[PDB]
C-alpha cells in the first residue's frame, strides 16, 4: 500500500532529527565539567522516622512551607506528617488501598490521590467542618493512574497507565487537555518551576516534553533502555532526571534536547524508582529498588553520597523547597527523613 | 507549649484509630481474581458472591470475610502494579473448559488453553508471588463434559490428549494445569471444577484459604 | 453546622447544681476540644475549664477547680458542665467554644451563643490598657495589650488570640498568633504585636468593627483575658 512509503518519510524525518542531534551534540556535561566541585561524601543521617503507615508505602509529597508531609501507603491511609515535631496532622481513610501517587497543593490545602481505581480523588484538608472531605473525584483515564502533581490551585495535571497524561480542573471535573502520544503507559510526572511545561516518563522508555495546556510533544527524550520508572526536573532550567530500571538515572537538556551522561554503575544492576533533584540541582538523589538510596553528583555522577539504610525497596523520594531534609519513603513502613 | 501537647495529643488519637484499623485489615482475608478469558470468571465471581482497574468484592461466608479483587478490567501492564498483591492470602484463578474448537474466536492461532496456561504459570513462577496458593477453578465443566464425547480433548493440542471419556480430559487438564508451577514445595494448587453449585464453590475457597492459613501458622510456631 | 446551641442556667441559688449541656450540631465533636468562658455582666470574659479530644486532659480554672467538673458525650455530641457548688461570683455569661489543634490549626474559631446564670448578686497578665473609645469610621485605630511573660516559644510562635463581639453578642476569632487572620474576617485587622507587646490595627474602621476588643494568651493552661475596649462609632 502507502503506509509503507509514508513511514518511510517518517524515517527519513527521523534521520534529519538524528543528524541535527549529533550536530549540536559535541561535548557532554562530563566534557564541560570534568572536575569541577567534587562533592566527596556528603552523607546525610536519619534525623527523624514515622512510623504511622503499617503497609507497603508508595507515595510521598512535600509541601510548600517545608515542613508538612503527605504520603500514602497500600492501606487506606494519608496521614499528614509534621516533620519538625514527628506529629500526625491528618489521616485520611482511602477508598483505593491501592495507590500508588499522592500530591500536596502549593496552596497547602489540598491533597490528590491516585492508585488503581483509575480516579484522582482530591480532599480538602482545612475544612470548616473540621475533617478532611473529599472534594472531587476526577475519572476517565481507562488504565492506572501513576502521578497527579498539583499543575496549580485548582488545574491538575496527572499521568495514568492509559498512555495519556491528562490535565484536570477541581472547580469543573473535565478534561481540559488530553496530551495522548506516548505509546506504553506513563509511570512520572513533574512540573516545570514555572509549571508552563511538564514531562512525563512512560513504559516506553522515552521522556517527552508538553505544554502546560494547548499541547502536543514538543520535545521527544529517547536513549534508555527498559522503562522510565520515575522522573524529575531542574530547580530552575532546562533540565530534568530521568529514572529508569536499566540502572541509569540520565538527564537531558531542554534548550538543547540532547543527551548529556548517565548515571550507571558497575554494582548496581537494580531499577531506579523514585529521583528528586537537590537544591540548585548539583546533586541527584534517586531511589532504588535494592533497599537503598543514593545520591548522584548531578554534573559529574559517580558517589557524591550514600542514603541507604532502608529495610524494603525505596518507593517515593522527595527533596523539600528548602532543602534542609530529603524524605525517602520506601516500602517498609516507615518514613526515614534524612538531612 | 499547650498546643503542641494538645497536639501531641491529637496524634496519639491518630496512633491508636491506625492502631485498630491495622488489626481490622490483618483479620481480612484479601483474594485477587484472575480471569484469563471474561467468559466463566463473571459466573464464578457470581457464585461466590452469592471503569476502575480495579473491582473490590467483599463479603463473608461462615464468619469469614473475604476481599475479592478483580483485575479484568485494567487494560494496562500487569507488572506495573501486581507487585501491589504481594501479600494476598490466596489468589483465585479461574478459566473455563468450554473453550478448545473456538481458538480464541478471534486469534485463531492460540487457543483459549494455551493464553491461559501462558498466564497461569506467569503468576505461579512469579516473583511477588513465590509462595501464594492459586485457587484454580475450572468452569463451564458441563458443557465441556456435554461435547468432549463428540469432540475429544486432542484438539486443543495435537499431543495425545486421553481417551474421548470426560475422566480422561479432565485428569489430562488439569495435570497439564499443576506441572506448570515450579515451586510445588511452597506453593501448591487447588483444582476445582466449577459447576452450578453456587454454595459449593463459596465452601471449597473457605477450605483452600483454611488450608493455605494453616500452613501459614505451620511455618509461623517453632516447626517448620 | 458548629452551631453551639448552649443549654441550661437559670435561676439557681447559692451552692446549687446545674446542667449546662451544650449541644454541638457535628462537627466532629470528639475531635475538637471544648472550652468553656465565662463573663460577669459588669466584667470581662473568663476562661473556666478545658477537655481535649475524647476526655483526654481535663483543666480547670484555680477558682472552679473543684466546683465545677465538665465532661463530654462524642455519640450524642453534647459537653456536661456540672456545678458541684455555686456562689455570688458564679453569675456569669457561660459561653463554650471550639478548639482544635495542629500546625495549620485555628482555635477558638467559634464561640456557641451561651447561657446566663443569674445565681445572685503568678500567671500571664493580659493587661490591656485600652478602654472605651469613641472613634470615627476610616481611622486607624490601634489596640494594644501586653504581657508578663514573653508569649514566643522556642516552636518561633506566640499564643495571642484577638477577640471581637459587639455587646451582647459571642465573640469570634480575628487573629490566633499575632499574625494569621481567621474565617469571616477581613485583611484590615492584623495582629502585628511583638514578642511581649501586641498590638490591633483597623485601617477601616466599621460598624461590626464597634464592640469590645479581647486579647488572650495560650502559653500556659490556665488562660487569661483584658478589659474589654468598646470602639463606640461616635
Known amino acids: 500500500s502507502e503506509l509503507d512509503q509514508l513511514r518511510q518519510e517518517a524515517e527519513q524525518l527521523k534521520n534529519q532529527i538524528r543528524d541535527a542531534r549529533k550536530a549540536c551534540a559535541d561535548a557532554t556535561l562530563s566534557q564541560i565539567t570534568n572536575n569541577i566541585d567534587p562533592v566527596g561524601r556528603i552523607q546525610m543521617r536519619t534525623r527523624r522516622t514515622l512510623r504511622g503507615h503499617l503497609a507497603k508505602i508508595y507515595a510521598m509529597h512535600w509541601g510548600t512551607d517545608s515542613r508538612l508531609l503527605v504520603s500514602a501507603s497500600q492501606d487506606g491511609k494519608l496521614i499528614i506528617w509534621d516533620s519538625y515535631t514527628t506529629n500526625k496532622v491528618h489521616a485520611i481513610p482511602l477508598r483505593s488501598s491501592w495507590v500508588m501517587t499522592c500530591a500536596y497543593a502549593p496552596s497547602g490545602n489540598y491533597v490528590a490521590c491516585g492508585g488503581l481505581d483509575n480516579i484522582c480523588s482530591i480532599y480538602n484538608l482545612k475544612t470548616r467542618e473540621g475533617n478532611v472531605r473529599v472534594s472531587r473525584e476526577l475519572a476517565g483515564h481507562t488504565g492506572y493512574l501513576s502521578c497527579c502533581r498539583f499543575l496549580d490551585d485548582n488545574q491538575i495535571v496527572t499521568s495514568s497507565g492509559d498512555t495519556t497524561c491528562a490535565l484536570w480542573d477541581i472547580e469543573t471535573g473535565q478534561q481540559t487537555t488530553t496530551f495522548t502520544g506516548h505509546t506504553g503507559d506513563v509511570m512520572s510526572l513533574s512540573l516545570a518551576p514555572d509549571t508552563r511545561l511538564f514531562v512525563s516518563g512512560a513504559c516506553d522508555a522515552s521522556a517527552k516534553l508538553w505544554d502546560v495546556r494547548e499541547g502536543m510533544c514538543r520535545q521527544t527524550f529517547t536513549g534508555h533502555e527498559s522503562d522510565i520508572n520515575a522522573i524529575c526536573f531542574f530547580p530552575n532550567g532546562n533540565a530534568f532526571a530521568t529514572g529508569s530500571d536499566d540502572a541509569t538515572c540520565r538527564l537531558f537538556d531542554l534548550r538543547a534536547d540532547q543527551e548529556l551522561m548517565t548515571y550507571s554503575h558497575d554494582n548496581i544492576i537494580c531499577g531506579i524508582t523514585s529521583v528528586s533533584f537537590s537544591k540548585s540541582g548539583r546533586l541527584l538523589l534517586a531511589g532504588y529498588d535494592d533497599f537503598n538510596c543514593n545520591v548522584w553528583d548531578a554534573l559529574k555522577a559517580d558517589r557524591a553520597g550514600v542514603l541507604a539504610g532502608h529495610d524494603n525497596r525505596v518507593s517515593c523520594l522527595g527533596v523539600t523547597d528548602d532543602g534542609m531534609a530529603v524524605a525517602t519513603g520506601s516500602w517498609d513502613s516507615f518514613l526515614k527523613i534524612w538531612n | 507549649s499547650a498546643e503542641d501537647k494538645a497536639a501531641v495529643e491529637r496524634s496519639k488519637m491518630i496512633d491508636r484509630n491506625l492502631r485498630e484499623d491495622g488489626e481490622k485489615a490483618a483479620r481480612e482475608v484479601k483474594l485477587l481474581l484472575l480471569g484469563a478469558g471474561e467468559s466463566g470468571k463473571n459466573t464464578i465471581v457470581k457464585q461466590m458472591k452469592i471503569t476502575t482497574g480495579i473491582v473490590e468484592t467483599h463479603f463473608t461466608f461462615k464468619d469469614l470475610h473475604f476481599k475479592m479483587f478483580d483485575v479484568g478490567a485494567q487494560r494496562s501492564e500487569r507488572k506495573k502494579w501486581i507487585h501491589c498483591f504481594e501479600g494476598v492470602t490466596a489468589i483465585i484463578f479461574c478459566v473455563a473448559l468450554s473453550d478448545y474448537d473456538l481458538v480464541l474466536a478471534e486469534d485463531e492461532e492460540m487457543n483459549r488453553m494455551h493464553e491461559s496456561m501462558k498466564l497461569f504459570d506467569s503468576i505461579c513462577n512469579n516473583k511477588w508471588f513465590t509462595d501464594t496458593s492459586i485457587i484454580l477453578f475450572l468452569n463451564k465443566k458441563d458443557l465441556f463434559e456435554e461435547k468432549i464425547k463428540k469432540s475429544p480433548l486432542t484438539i486443543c493440542y495435537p499431543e495425545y490428549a486421553g481417551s474421548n471419556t470426560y475422566e480422561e480430559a479432565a485428569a489430562y487438564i488439569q495435570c497439564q494445569f499443576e506441572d506448570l508451577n515450579k515451586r510445588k514445595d511452597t506453593k501448591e494448587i487447588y483444582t476445582h471444577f466449577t459447576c452450578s453449585t453456587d454454595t459449593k464453590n463459596v465452601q471449597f475457597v473457605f477450605d483452600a484459604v483454611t488450608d493455605v492459613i494453616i500452613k501459614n501458622n505451620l511455618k509461623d510456631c517453632g516447626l517448620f | 453546622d458548629v452551631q453551639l446551641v448552649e443549654s441550661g442556667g437559670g435561676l439557681v441559688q447559692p451552692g446549687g447544681s446545674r446542667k449546662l449541656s451544650c449541644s454541638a450540631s457535628?462537627?466532629?465533636?470528639?475531635?475538637?476540644?471544648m472550652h468553656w468562658v465565662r463573663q460577669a455582666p459588669e466584667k470581662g470574659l473568663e476562661w473556666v475549664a478545658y477537655?481535649?479530644?475524647?476526655?483526654?486532659?481535663?483543666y480547670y480554672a484555680d477558682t472552679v477547680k473543684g466546683r465545677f467538673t465538665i465532661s463530654r458525650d462524642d455519640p450524642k455530641n453534647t459537653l456536661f458542665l456540672q456545678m458541684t457548688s455555686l456562689r455570688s461570683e458564679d453569675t456569669a455569661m457561660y459561653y463554650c467554644?471550639?478548639?482544635?489543634?495542629?500546625?495549620?490549626?485555628?482555635?477558638?474559631?467559634?464561640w456557641g451563643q451561651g447561657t446566663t446564670l443569674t445565681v445572685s448578686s503568678s500567671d500571664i497578665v493580659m493587661t490591656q490598657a485600652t478602654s472605651s473609645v469613641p472613634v470615627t469610621p476610616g481611622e486607624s485605630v490601634s489596640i494594644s495589650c501586653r504581657s508578663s511573660?514573653?508569649?514566643?516559644?522556642?516552636?518561633?510562635?506566640?499564643?495571642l488570640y484577638w477577640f471581637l463581639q459587639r455587646p451582647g453578642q459571642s465573640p469570634q476569632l480575628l487573629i490566633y498568633?499575632?499574625?494569621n487572620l481567621a474565617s469571616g474576617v477581613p485583611d484590615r485587622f492584623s495582629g502585628s504585636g511583638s514578642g511581649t507587646a501586641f498590638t490591633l490595627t483597623i485601617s477601616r474602621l466599621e460598624a461590626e468593627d464597634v464592640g469590645v476588643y479581647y486579647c488572650?494568651?495560650?502559653?500556659?493552661?490556665?488562660?487569661?483575658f483584658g478589659a474589654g475596649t468598646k470602639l463606640e462609632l461616635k
Open positions: 467554644v471550639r478548639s482544635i489543634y495542629y500546625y495549620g490549626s485555628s482555635p477558638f474559631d467559634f
Open positions: 457535628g462537627f466532629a465533636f470528639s475531635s475538637f476540644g
Open positions: 477537655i481535649s479530644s475524647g476526655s483526654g486532659t481535663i
Open positions: 511573660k514573653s508569649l514566643l516559644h522556642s516552636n518561633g510562635n506566640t499564643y
Open positions: 498568633r499575632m499574625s
Open positions: 488572650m494568651q495560650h502559653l500556659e493552661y490556665p488562660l487569661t
